[PDB]
Amino acid sequence: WLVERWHFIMLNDTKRNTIYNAAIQKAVCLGSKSVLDIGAGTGILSMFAKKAGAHSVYACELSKTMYELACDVVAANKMEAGIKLLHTKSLDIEIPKHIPERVSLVVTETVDAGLFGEGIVESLIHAWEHLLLQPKTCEKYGKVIPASAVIFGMAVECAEIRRHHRVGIKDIAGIHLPTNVKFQSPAYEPYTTEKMSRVPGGYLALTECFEIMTVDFNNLQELKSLATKKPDKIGIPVIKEGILDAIMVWFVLQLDDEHSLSTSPSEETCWEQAVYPVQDLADYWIKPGDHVMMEVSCQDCYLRIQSISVLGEQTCILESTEIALLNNIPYHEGFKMAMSKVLSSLTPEKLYNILEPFYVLDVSEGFSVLPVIAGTLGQVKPYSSVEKDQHRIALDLISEANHFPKETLEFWLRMLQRPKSDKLWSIIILDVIEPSGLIQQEIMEKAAISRCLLQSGGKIFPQYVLMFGLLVESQTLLEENAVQGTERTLGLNIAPFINQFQVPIRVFLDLSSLPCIPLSKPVELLRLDLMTPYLNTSNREVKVYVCKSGRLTAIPFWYHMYLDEEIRLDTSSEASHWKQAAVVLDNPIQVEMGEELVLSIQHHKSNVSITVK
Ligand SMILES: CCc1ncccc1CNCCCCSC[C@H]1O[C@@H](n2ccc3c(N)ncnc32)[C@H](O)[C@@H]1O
């Protein structure tokens, strides 16, 4: 996505466009004839201002792509005249070099889920100092839209956030994670952004919604104060029993006295929430009577919530995907059983030459405990492919905890080559599916190279991967892909220009939470076979029976990774550490029930095309 997917949903958000158009109309008609749009994007708000009757509008845009996009959009609405587009950061605008005079109004949307994270403060400190007329002591004085913001917080239970920042278990498929290894997420990048109005498994409010801070965007003396201001130590009373998983954060923008917009979680709004995961506590269970403690500081750009507590030893930093992995139990229970079945078929004497062990290579991209599980099964010499030294220490300490004598687990990294001179691999684990929901690049090549390093009857895991698909009517996937005409942009012609950058395939999708309608059943779209390349789909057609009548907009897809013909891992399972993906159609097709719809699935290297025929 060269053009950020936020651009599509926000331009389709008719409410937001109307609230901003009314607020700018109000300001213009009250004398604000000179407007500066910071982060103009497609330049809709700048076009609003000129349409409202502003004399001169100046639209600055950081991104080259978005700047060139606005030039076309503004030019195409026959408004190139009174609006100057500036490929620049706000900070680098100078009067009179770039803009003739100081402006009487600033409009800005440089706002993320945690409000401050797109540098609105720094931008508006500069604006008052250099670009804006003096404030009120109208065409005489300068003002900003939005005028002010109120930042809210809420302690929440949410097992979906939990499984991404905390390792919930003490034992994974036979191996024990020692108490002396403390797994922390990277958020211990201070907040993640989630559409909490549809987060899988929902969330529960453990506290009442509380006020984290306020900001007056029309007060320069206040904005300059935030960098040095001492953190606000607070404690929020608990109102419901549950597990403290995160502090869910949103805000309310006051554009003017009459118009406001909230990022409060809602299936009506497009807005996402700042999620501050809770970790590094002995217990997470909170009850009515207890207090959620935290320090709030906005000193260096981001809103920070540190020192989260409740009032009534090696550290291994894992990625969220790696924590999710450690919590994906079926994945590890499957791998344990699938490996042992192969260890039994080769040399069942070695399953729990004496000096010769089972050679097991794990080529999993990131952190993985598959080698340890293997080590517990029999006379096995397992190899780790972890790069990070922090990961090596953790796995060494896990190995110690699972009664491995020193140097039992080896580290391959410090090219796919034989384990020894005249010895071959009994099992080779490969990384087939990206977290994105697409196939790993050069998987067929690594699979082919790996086939030749195998012992007689040895196995690459997974042996094959089936991609499953689904016909869905999803307005949501459609409205996140392409702008729906002119109506939503309030008569302005922007859709034909932004929709040039239409993504064919949506990645990092939470299929489970997606609002859509199934028009079919999950159907096998292609086979990717690691043991037998010949059974790989080159470019095959699939006949999909249409179970429900509706407007086909997308084909969500996931995988069934087969370790053997019996044991299969699902990349769409509840505990899955993979996200799913979807082919979104450029033009939606109306499908009738009882109809045998054809899909043209082309597969080359790790790329897959799906089209309606
Ligand atoms: C509650 C949050 C939220 N929830 C849900 C969806 C969306 C969103 C919010 N939107 C999120 C994507 C941030 C937009 S940034 C606005 C646009 O303006 C540009 N920009 C950014 C800073 C800047 C500058 N100093 N000078 C000039 N242009 C500047 C950026 O490159 C960008 O194109």
- CA–CA gap between residue 486 and residue 491 (Å, rounded): 5
Q: Is the CB of 261 under 6 A from ligand 1?
A: no
What length is written for the chain?
613
Sequence-distant (6+) residues with CB within 8 A of 590 are: 550, 551, 552
Taking the centre of ligand 1 as the mean of its atom positions, its distance from the CA of residue 7, in whole angstroms, is 9
- CA–CA gap between residue 165 and residue 538 (Å, rounded): 40
Instruction: Give me the amino acid identity at 421.
Output: S
Q: Is the CB of 89 under 6 A from ligand 1?
A: yes
Residue 530 belongs to what H/E stretch?
none
The minimum-distance atom of ligand 1 relative to the CA of 111 is 9
Taking the centre of ligand 1 as the mean of its atom positions, its distance from the CA of residue 578, in whole angstroms, is 28
3-state secondary structure of 544: strand
Taking the centre of ligand 1 as the mean of its atom positions, its distance from the CA of residue 16, in whole angstroms, is 15
Taking the centre of ligand 1 as the mean of its atom positions, its distance from the CA of residue 11, in whole angstroms, is 13
- Resolution of the determined structure in angstroms stands at 2.8
Determine how many CB atoms are found less than 10 A away from the CB of residue 245. 26
**Which residues sit directly before a break in the chain (C to N > 2.5 Å)?**
137, 188, 312, 352, 414
Atom 33 in ligand 1: residue holding the nearest Cα: 41
Q: Is the CB of 118 under 6 A from ligand 1?
A: yes
Pick from 423, 412, 390, 537: nearest CA to 469? 537
Q: Are 594 and 519 in contact (CB under 8 A)?
A: no
Pocket test for ligand 1, best of 1, 2, 3, 6 (most atoms within 8 A of CB): 6
Taking the centre of ligand 1 as the mean of its atom positions, its distance from the CA of residue 204, in whole angstroms, is 30
- The pair phi, psi for residue 287, each rounded to 5°, is -125, 155
Q: Are 106 and 132 in contact (CB under 8 A)?
A: yes
| Residue position matching structure tokens 């195409």 | 76
Q: Is the CB of 369 under 6 A from ligand 1?
A: no
Atom 5 in ligand 1: residue holding the nearest Cα: 271
Sequence-distant (6+) residues with CB within 8 A of 414 are: none
Pocket test for ligand 1, best of 17, 110, 123, 193 (most atoms within 8 A of CB): 110
Q: Are 74 and 85 in contact (CB under 8 A)?
A: yes
Taking the centre of ligand 1 as the mean of its atom positions, its distance from the CA of residue 110, in whole angstroms, is 4
| Residue position matching structure tokens 């500069």 | 126
Question: Secondary structure of the chain: what % helix, strand, coil (to 5)?
Answer: 25, 35, 40
Packing angle between helix 44-52 and helix 14-29, nearest 10 degrees?
A: 40
- The pair phi, psi for residue 517, each rounded to 5°, is -125, 130
Q: Is the CB of 39 under 6 A from ligand 1?
A: yes
Pick from 243, 210, 236: nearest CA to 291? 236
- CA–CA gap between residue 244 and residue 154 (Å, rounded): 10
Taking the centre of ligand 1 as the mean of its atom positions, its distance from the CA of residue 349, in whole angstroms, is 62
Q: What is the DSSP string of 102-158?
A: -BSEEEE---BTTBGGG-HHHHHHHIIIIIBPP-----SS-EEES-EEEEEEEEEE-
Phi and psi based region of residue 605 (left: phi greater than 0; alpha: psi -120 to 50; beta: remaining): left
Residue 68 belongs to what H/E stretch?
helix 64-76
Q: Is the CB of 321 under 6 A from ligand 1?
A: no
The minimum-distance atom of ligand 1 relative to the CA of 193 is 4
Taking the centre of ligand 1 as the mean of its atom positions, its distance from the CA of residue 300, in whole angstroms, is 18
Taking the centre of ligand 1 as the mean of its atom positions, its distance from the CA of residue 477, in whole angstroms, is 21
Q: Are 82 and 55 in contact (CB under 8 A)?
A: yes
